[PDB]
């Protein structure tokens with residue numbers, strides 16, 4: 001596994017095995033790709049980040065991942081694939097977040113933006129996200145580069 005600190009100096013435990021920290025994860029994170037471009041969302045407070053969110057009642061992690069993509073980017077996933085899972089050790093609460101890769105089939109219109117500003121398309125992600133104020137803190141740690149390298153080698157990009 002991988003153990004490092006996040007933007008707010010909280011301990012993050014990253015692994016690429018089939019749900020090692022928890023079999024019931026309360027959070028999801030979806031690395032989206034619309035062909036040759038990265039599909040991101042713009043949170044009203046945080047900024048630029050990959051779609052994600054909490055798992056709702058009578059919903060599984062995979063269901064929550066597809067919903068978060070539609071709720072934040074309004075996109076339909078062609079193939080959702082489990083990449084890994086991470087544990088964030090905060091001051092009081094501990095969060096178990098599931099990492100998913102979504103190959104985007106299409107981008108459709110949305111009626112409401114759930115704390116978001118709609119879909120965002122990037123041909124290539126900026127050189128330093130930890131310095132970039134337009135991006136979210138969830139993009140400003142080692143979870144993002146390690147996952148992209150694993151994703152690269154998966155490799156389902158092509």
Ligand SMILES: Nc1nc2c(ncn2[C@@H]2O[C@H](COP(=O)(O)OP(=O)(O)OP(=O)(O)O)[C@@H](O)[C@H]2O)c(=O)[nH]1
Pocket residue numbers: 006007008010012029054088090091093095097138141
């Ligand atoms: N590093 C990192 N920390 C995260 C991520 N998502 C959430 N956190 C941390 O999790 C905490 C917030 O978790 P939430 O689930 O949103 O908690 P909440 O909104 O107060 O309320 P609940 O819905 O009851 O959980 C903060 O300490 C964040 O730093 C993530 O993707 N990466």
